Write a protein that binds this ligand. Structure first.
Ligand SMILES: Cc1cc2nc3c(=O)[nH]c(=O)nc-3n(C[C@H](O)[C@H](O)[C@H](O)COP(=O)(O)OP(=O)(O)OC[C@H]3O[C@@H](n4cnc5c(N)ncnc54)[C@H](O)[C@@H]3O)c2cc1C
Ligand SMILES: Cc1cc2nc3c(=O)[nH]c(=O)nc-3n(C[C@H](O)[C@H](O)[C@H](O)COP(=O)(O)OP(=O)(O)OC[C@H]3O[C@@H](n4cnc5c(N)ncnc54)[C@H](O)[C@@H]3O)c2cc1C
Ligand SMILES: *SCCNC(=O)CCNC(=O)[C@H](O)C(C)(C)COP(=O)(O)OP(=O)(O)OC[C@H]1O[C@@H](n2cnc3c(N)ncnc32)[C@H](O)[C@@H]1OP(=O)(O)O
Ligand SMILES: *SCCNC(=O)CCNC(=O)[C@H](O)C(C)(C)COP(=O)(O)OP(=O)(O)OC[C@H]1O[C@@H](n2cnc3c(N)ncnc32)[C@H](O)[C@@H]1OP(=O)(O)O
Ligand SMILES: [Cl-]
Ligand SMILES: [Cl-]
Ligand SMILES: [Cl-]
Ligand SMILES: [Cl-]
Ligand SMILES: [Cl-]
Ligand SMILES: [Cl-]
Ligand SMILES: [Mg+2]
Ligand SMILES: [Mg+2]
Lengths: 437, 437
């Protein structure tokens, strides 16, 4: 079938590539409104930090290379401006010529993702981060203005990564956030080490703080404070890229996202939606879920490829919401329902704090593992881990446990890989099980 | 009930402690033939390397302290020499006085473990490593003789750990092994990094090599080579400590181990066996399994405690054989049936080598993950991982998968925790699933 994809990055380029694996005959075209396809979204903070020097690392493909290797046509600087779903075409604006045309499809795959929110100030020193163009712009501005003092707005995991990278690059960031709910996917009390790490490096932060006014480099804050900053990076949330979809028959939710079934189909025949734009449900509980992360974009890309060109009995089973961020010396990982969603269950909490590995083995550090379970059926609802070592390992194991609706009690049976550098004969995970009675 | 335990270490002392958690009234006595109870078996190589220098990490308790804390009586230098099961007593030799006596029991728990094999040479410079007495003897010999050149015999995980530790201590070890089958718990073609790490540090080794003759410090080898060594550490396997059991009605297998049911019961009423001495079955396949490692000793200890003084519905579900060793910069981990046992199945192998984390992200290292599955039911039979980073994480996740009867194909559904320092949007585990078929 003739395949049209909207968006040429984590969901879109991946999905097109996965289709080509199964189908070498069908014509596949991707439209991308911006300059670059297949940029490494998750690499961008590290590019800013000069942790990733080789820009070859930030871009996986050019349209020419993508066609040479995969025979997939990608048109950059081409923005889909409408979906004419009944005639099965899309309206495309060629941004270089400002001329529009229609492209027909047999199957349409929407992976337009999300755009950065802006505070809306009239300021030449303020930047958001979403693609490689933005990264280039930030880097250029730092060099052109010899930026030192930088205001980082927002305490979400990406903004935190940006802050760390600015610090390591040698700049002097200050963090502000409009509330005290930093790194919001993690349990609030377990986020303390973020503040500790800031304090340790004398990186200033202010929570429940906001920009009031901007006058050149002079920033006035809600608190009444006035500070001079060379640059501002705003990480104040994102919004779905769905304005071009509203005139079509596709059903959007009140927030502008696209609900999909387990085949990643929209309500309209022959149109799929994947990635950040799509909403689904949890795997382990009967609740809606939105998990705008890379794993889900890649998984959906594969499922849609099977739907279109492979085994059409392959369907999504829902999200667990596994997520993770590194901040300086610490790892913060969680999986399952969000903190605010626990209230929809009758639940209990079990936790342990123990060395990541054998206490006598050097380089040890305390790992805090927390598990919530449903009192009606003993099933694990949520797990969270914070520490310098071992948090990703425990949370990945628990993700696998939840995938199978494992109970908290059965954690006593988990057979860990033990040698002194790695764990304990009764691992932290085992101890959760022993302590659950 | 009056409880007698044989062996006061990983299985025995742990089990006694777990019983006391549940039962404060029963008399509990442990007989230990050697000097120390509760020594840290797994720490011993690191004590030798002077990595672990605090004595308090080398053993947890003296009998006096154990009694003060838990009211459990432990008699060291007391060797059980016979089990008189028809009269419900054991015969015990007080090794200090050289007098024997009978001790009655209502329940008997056997955790005698295994002893190190010896090459049988008459050599004052040769040592084996099994307990803290051995560790002290090795340390003292090194200092008393200004040991520099050490011959390490055997290439199993214990020997490898001892070699690394002798090197870090500043000594000069040479490794020999009778064959090329080093680190046998790992796939034979995945062990090359062991040899690479030896070469990189110019630590000599010879495979297909054996001690032929010893004359003082002059060692003559199978290869015909003649070398002088200050010390020899022999790691040439272990044998079950079961000779004292043979005259009793307890059923032993032909290799000298004790088969037990899922309650860790022997064939004889009121007698349990746990730890290295015990044989059971795999959890995921219908085959016999023996896994002489700490996790199993500890899990069996808990189950036996529940059987005697707690919830007797709690039963073992079998072994997976999860195991791991560090050697210099590398980790070698595996789980499931042994390579030699794969032939009992119709199976296929799938593998991937990929960076442990995001390719553009620094400090990366290639991680090799291999998975064997049963073609009859797509179930996972064995997994193995080798790399500087991430191998323990992948194998623990796969251990949890096998616990849950996951098919290889369902690995595509594993929701990993992804950010650049930790993994990929399609993790190695996911790629195993995609590559299967
Ligand atoms: C700085 C940063 C760090 C991140 N770090 C992590 C992380 O550590 N872990 C994690 O799991 N996730 C991380 N993410 C999230 C991640 O990148 C997304 O979940 C993923 O990219 C979603 O895939 P997508 O295809 O939905 O959106 P994208 O990858 O953002 O691709 C959407 C594309 O569609 C294009 N587009 C939109 N509308 C149109 C149109 N009308 N016509 C043509 N093209 C259009 C856009 O320009 C864009 O290029 C990070 C994101 C950012 C920005
Ligand atoms: C150097 C070394 C490193 C190791 N590293 C690891 C590792 O990294 N990971 C891992 O999972 N495992 C490791 N192990 C394995 C581990 O220690 C065993 O699996 C565990 O100790 C088994 O517990 P057990 O109670 O069966 O035997 P043990 O812990 O060895 O205790 C058995 C005790 O019974 C006593 N005994 C025997 N017969 C009698 C008798 N007739 N009367 C009285 N007492 C008796 C013995 O003297 C001994 O003290 C290591 C072992 C060694 C020696
Ligand atoms: S923010 C974090 C996530 N963001 C993004 O992913 C950024 C943009 N991503 C993309 O544009 C695509 O994901 C690109 C980079 C184009 C890759 O697309 P694919 O996921 O489809 O992978 P490739 O085709 O480039 O192949 C790479 C290696 O993986 C193997 N492989 C992919 N898919 C499969 C399946 N379904 N089954 C078996 N193997 C598969 C490839 O064969 C290949 O192996 P190599 O030995 O490296 O060639
Ligand atoms: S070779 C690898 C393993 N090494 C060996 O096992 C060496 C020999 N080990 C032993 O001799 C025993 O294991 C000793 C050290 C004597 C004690 O065994 P336990 O496993 O029972 O540990 P403790 O009794 O000293 O208790 C310590 C902490 O763990 C908590 N805890 C133990 N058991 C449970 C259960 N069943 N349920 C909930 N919690 C449990 C304790 O409460 C305790 O916590 P603290 O921080 O000390 O208050
Ligand atoms: Cl990326
Ligand atoms: Cl239309
Ligand atoms: Cl729907
Ligand atoms: Cl230990
Ligand atoms: Cl008898
Ligand atoms: Cl590969
Ligand atoms: Mg007799
Ligand atoms: Mg490769």
């Amino acid at each position: 079938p003739k395949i049209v994809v909207v968006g040429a990055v984590a969901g879109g380029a991946t999905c097109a590539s996965q289709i080509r694996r199964l189908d070498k005959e069908s014509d596949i075209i991707i439209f991308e409104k911006d300059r670059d396809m297949s940029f490494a979204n998750c690499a961008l903070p590290y590019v800013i930090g000069e942790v990733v020097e080789d820009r070859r690392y930030a871009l996986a493909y050019t349209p020419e290379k993508f066609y040479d290797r995969k025979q997939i046509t990608v048109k950059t600087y081409h923005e889909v401006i409408a979906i004419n779903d009944e005639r099965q075409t899309v309206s495309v604006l060629n941004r270089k010529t400002n001329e529009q045309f229609e492209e027909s499809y047999d199957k349409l795959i929407l992976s337009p993702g999300a755009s950065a929110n802006s505070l809306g100030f009239e300021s030449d020193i303020t930047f958001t981060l979403r693609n490689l163009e933005d990264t280039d712009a930030i880097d250029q501005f730092i060099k052109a203005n010899q930026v030192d003092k930088v205001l980082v707005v927002g305490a979400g995991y990406v903004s935190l990564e940006v802050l760390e990278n600015l610090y390591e690059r040698g700049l002097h960031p200050t963090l502000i956030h409009r509330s005290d709910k930093i790194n919001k996917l993690m349990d609030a009390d377990m986020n303390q080490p973020i503040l500790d790490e800031l304090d340790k490096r004398e990186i200033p932060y202010r929570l429940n703080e906001e920009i009031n006014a901007i006058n050149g480099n002079e920033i006035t804050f809600k608190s009444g404070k006035v500070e001079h900053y060379d640059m501002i990076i705003e990480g104040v949330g994102t919004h779905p890229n769905s304005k071009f979809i509203e005139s079509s028959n596709i059903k959007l939710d009140r927030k502008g996202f696209i609900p999909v079934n387990d085949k990643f189909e929209t309500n309209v025949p022959n149109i799929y939606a994947i990635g950040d734009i799509a909403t689904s449900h949890y795997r382990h509980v009967d609740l809606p879920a939105s998990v705008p992360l890379a794993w889900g974009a890649h998984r959906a890309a594969s499922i849609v490829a099977e739907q279109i060109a492979g085994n059409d009995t392959i369907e999504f089973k829902g999200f667990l919401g596994n997520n993770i961020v590194k901040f300086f010396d610490y790892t913060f990982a969680s999986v399952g329902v969000k903190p605010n969603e626990l209230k929809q269950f009758d639940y209990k909490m079990v936790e342990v704090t123990q060395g990541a590995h054998a206490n006598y083995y050097p380089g040890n550090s305390p790992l805090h593992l927390r598990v919530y379970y449903d009192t009606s059926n003993r099933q694990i609802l949520r797990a969270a881990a914070v520490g310098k070592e071992g948090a990703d390992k425990r949370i990945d194991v628990l993700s696998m446990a939840m995938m199978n609706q494992l109970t908290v009690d059965e954690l006593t049976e988990f057979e860990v890989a033990f040698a002194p550098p790695y764990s304990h004969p009764k691992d932290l995970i085992n101890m959760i099980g022993y302590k659950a009675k």
